[PDB]
Amino acid sequence: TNGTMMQYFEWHLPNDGQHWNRLRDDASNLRNRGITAIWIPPAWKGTSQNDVGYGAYDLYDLGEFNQKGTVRTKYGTRSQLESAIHALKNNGVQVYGDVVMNHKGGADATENVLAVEVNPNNRNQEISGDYTIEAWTKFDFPGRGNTYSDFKWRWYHFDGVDWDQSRQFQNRIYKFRGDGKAWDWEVDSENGNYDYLMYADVDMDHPEVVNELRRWGEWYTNTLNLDGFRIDAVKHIKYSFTRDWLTHVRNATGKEMFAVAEFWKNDLGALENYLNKTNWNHSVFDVPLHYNLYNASNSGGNYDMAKLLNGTVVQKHPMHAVTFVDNHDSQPGESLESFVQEWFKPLAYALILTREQGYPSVFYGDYYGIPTHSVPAMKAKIDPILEARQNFAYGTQHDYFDHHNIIGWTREGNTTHPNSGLATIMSDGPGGEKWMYVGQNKAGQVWHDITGNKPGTVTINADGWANFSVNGGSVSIWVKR
Ligand SMILES: C[C@H]1O[C@H](O[C@H]2[C@H](O)[C@@H](O)[C@@H](O[C@H]3[C@H](O)[C@@H](O)[C@H](O)O[C@@H]3CO)O[C@@H]2CO)[C@H](O)[C@@H](O)[C@@H]1N[C@H]1C=C(CO)[C@@H](O[C@H]2O[C@H](CO)[C@@H](O[C@H]3O[C@H](CO)[C@@H](O[C@H]4O[C@H](CO)[C@@H](O[C@H]5O[C@H](C)[C@@H](N[C@H]6C=C(CO)[C@@H](O)[C@H](O)[C@H]6O)[C@H](O)[C@H]5O)[C@H](O)[C@H]4O)[C@H](O)[C@H]3O)[C@H](O)[C@H]2O)[C@H](O)[C@H]1O
Ligand SMILES: [Ca+2]
Ligand SMILES: [Ca+2]
Ligand SMILES: [Ca+2]
Ligand code: NA
């Protein structure tokens, strides 16, 4: 059976503490639609109650301590999360936790630290003399005390900050002075060295930090019975640290732990470097495919559809690609805004859901809508595609990426999964037809469009061929009636 992940949040969810409850209520529903794994938002305490969670204050506070002016996170309390996960586990759905280790925000107090300024466009270049700044580096976790962990963070656990509380200049980055203080390596080389991103940057060279993060990893996994991870911001984290952290947590827990890493760069070469340096021990989001889809959706029919997979992770390394259409960063108004246009969106979902390559991810914002911006729920359009993946998308695949508008592929089905087999056909331009092979054994069967976009039927010929059709700017998915 085909695996399907859902990203179960978007940026603009309400701060009503109800999100874990929503997830609990949806557990049977998701299982029935073919969702086999859920990626939950940051579960820990952020810099405030309405923090999406990437301003990660205390990784041991899952909405259970009174810190940052709130007990619950944005999403709910720890006991509410724990019953949502039980509901999921009871329905055979796996749970992936987000993992934010690059930085810590929302320090309890400042410290006076000797620092040097570096060039924001080249963090290898020092551009000032040394001087003392007031840095937000002191974390004591007053609400939690020493429960679960007695580790306290101080300036020397960090490499630098972008904020001097005493002077309050913008567009500065401060590297701390001290013995063996340097930006970590290997990290992405955009801006010279891209170790520094935001908040207080974690020093992955520091042996107490490495030990603390490994131990937090086991604790998080065990406390919540997680089946895997989505790892945040990996281009800004020393590559060998991520590789060995994951191995550690897998060894310590005895579980396989699937992991997908967010390496945000539209560059297949950079992604292959990352995968080589981490020894192929986890997957990456297919960021190049997201940009291909985004650009195709904006090209008004003029994109060359035969080239839709060129330069992508899924084309080259299918077993290490998590495919997606949109996420909380590409949604309107957000940091990496590059939202796939609504008319193309069912085509993009058919591409990732009905081909044999890659591990696909459905976005909450697409499925349930983004009411704050004007994005309607596309549940009605995505559901039949999820049904095709669940029941029909099996067996040998035949690809027809051979025209600038009209492309398609077929699946022959297999003997496990009866009635399985399909022909997907789509056009970014005018409608039309394509001759495609579904298998000699399907001769004489009558097929219909599961999307309901094309009314009518198609009878498979004596040799296993049929002329499948599609409307303009549309997708049809043909299966046995
Ligand atoms: C979003 C994405 O970013 C990166 O991607 C880059 C990319 O790498 C780069 O290459 C390029 O991409 C291009 C591609 O390469 C191309 O190939 C392609 O073609 O085109 C692309 C061009 O678009 O650009 C990209 C975007 O820049 C990165 O690589 C990705 O990984 C990343 N996505 C993931 C990463 C995330 C981080 O976890 C996450 O980001 C979210 O969430 C962020 C955090 O909320 C948010 O960040 C923004 O907002 C922050 C908060 O405002 C801001 O922080 C700054 O300001 C703070 C003040 O608010 C500073 O805090 C310090 O000072 C305060 C005062 C302190 N508070 C005190 C004070 C008090 C009162 O006295 C009290 O209230 C408190 O209690 C006290 O403590 C505090 O403690 C201090 O620490 C802070 O230091 C500042 O940094 C961030 O800077 C700002 O960025 C993101 O916007 C958002 O997206 C993603 O969701 C995740 O998926
Ligand atoms: Ca870093
Ligand atoms: Ca360092
Ligand atoms: Ca075209
Ligand atoms: Na660092």
Q: From the CB of 106, is ligand 1 less than 6 Å away?
A: yes
Residue 362: which region, alpha, beta or left (left: phi > 0; alpha: psi -120 to 50)?
Answer: beta
Q: From the CB of 200, is ligand 1 less than 6 Å away?
A: yes
CA-108 nearest atom, ligand 1: 78
- CA 310 to ligand 4 center in whole angstroms: 15
Residues 6+ apart with CB under 8 A from 366: 325, 326, 345, 349, 375, 378, 382
- CA 397 to ligand 4 center in whole angstroms: 23
Cα gap 187→103, rounded to integer Å: 14
Contact (Cβ atoms closer than 8 angstroms) between residue 66 and residue 143: yes
- CA 159 to ligand 2 center in whole angstroms: 8
Token digits for 370? 């983004």
Cα gap 475→323, rounded to integer Å: 19
Q: Which one-letter amino acid corresponds to residue 101?
A: M
Minimal-distance CA residue to ligand 1 atom 3: 335
Token digits for 403? 């025209």
Closest ligand to residue 406's CA: 4
Q: From the CB of 163, is ligand 1 less than 6 Å away?
A: yes
Contact (Cβ atoms closer than 8 angstroms) between residue 361 and residue 318: no
Q: Which one-letter amino acid corresponds to residue 341?
A: Q
Cα gap 347→208, rounded to integer Å: 49
- CA 173 to ligand 3 center in whole angstroms: 14
Task: List, in sequence order, every residue forming a beta bridge with 135; answer none if it has no partner.
Answer: 111
Spot the catalytic one: 117, 262, 366, 387: 262
CA-233 nearest atom, ligand 1: 31
Token digits for 472? 């303009």
User: Can you say whether the dihedral through the CA atoms of 38, 41, 45, 50 is positive or negative?
Assistant: negative
**In which order are the strands placed within the sheet that holds 422-427?**
397-400, 406-411, 422-427, 474-480, 446-449, 457-459
Minimal-distance CA residue to ligand 1 atom 41: 54
Q: From the CB of 173, is ligand 1 less than 6 Å away?
A: no
| Stated resolution in angstroms | 2.1
Contact (Cβ atoms closer than 8 angstroms) between residue 360 and residue 353: yes
**Is 262 part of the annotated catalytic residue set?**
yes
- CA 368 to ligand 3 center in whole angstroms: 42
Q: From the CB of 55, is ligand 1 less than 6 Å away?
A: yes
Q: From the CB of 201, is ligand 1 less than 6 Å away?
A: no
- Tell me how far CA of residue 186 lies from CA of 165, 205, 235, 236, 241, in angstroms: 30, 11, 9, 9, 9
Q: Which domains does the chain have, with CATH numbers?
A: 1-101+207-394 (3.20.20.80), 102-206 (2.40.30.140), 395-481 (2.60.40.1180)
Single out the residue of 233, 236, 250, 215 nearest to residue 42, CA to CA: 233
**Is 232 part of the annotated catalytic residue set?**
yes
Question: What's the gap between Cα 464 and its chain centre?
Answer: 39
Contact (Cβ atoms closer than 8 angstroms) between residue 262 and residue 300: no
Contact (Cβ atoms closer than 8 angstroms) between residue 30 and residue 93: yes
Between β-strands 173-176 and 200-202, what pairing exists: parallel, antiparallel or unpaired? Answer: unpaired
Q: Which one-letter amino acid corresponds to residue 357?
A: Q
Angle at 360 between CA 21 and CA 442, to 5 degrees: 120
Token digits for 465? 């061929």
Spot the catalytic one: 61, 184, 232, 366: 232
Contact (Cβ atoms closer than 8 angstroms) between residue 236 and residue 270: no
Cα gap 440→457, rounded to integer Å: 18
CA-327 nearest atom, ligand 1: 98
Q: From the CB of 162, is ligand 1 less than 6 Å away?
A: yes
HEC sequence for the chain: CCCCEEECCCCCCCCCCCHHHHHHHHHHHHHHCCCCEEEECCCCEECCCCCCCCCEEECCCCCCCCECCECCCCCCCHHHHHHHHHHHHHCCCEEEEEECCCEECCCCEEEEEEEEEEECCEEEEECCCCEEEEEEEEECCCCCCCCCCCCCECHHHEEEECCCCCCCCCCCEEEECCCCCCCCCCCCCCCCCCCCCCCEEECCCCHHHHHHHHHHHHHHHHHHCCCEEEECCHHHCCHHHHHHHHHHHHHHHCCCCEEEECCCCCCHHHHHHHHHHCCCCCEEECHHHHHHHHHHHCCCCCCCHHHCCCCCHHHHCHHHEEEECCCCCCCCCCCCCCCCCCCCHHHHHHHHHHCCCCEEEEEHHHHHCECCCCECCCHHHHHHHHHHHHHCCCCCEEEECCCCCEEEEEECCCCCCCCCCEEEEEECCCCEEEEEECCHHHCCCEEEECCCCCCCEEECCCCCEEEEEECCCEEEEEEEC
Contact (Cβ atoms closer than 8 angstroms) between residue 88 and residue 39: no
Token digits for 253? 């827990």
CA-104 nearest atom, ligand 1: 82
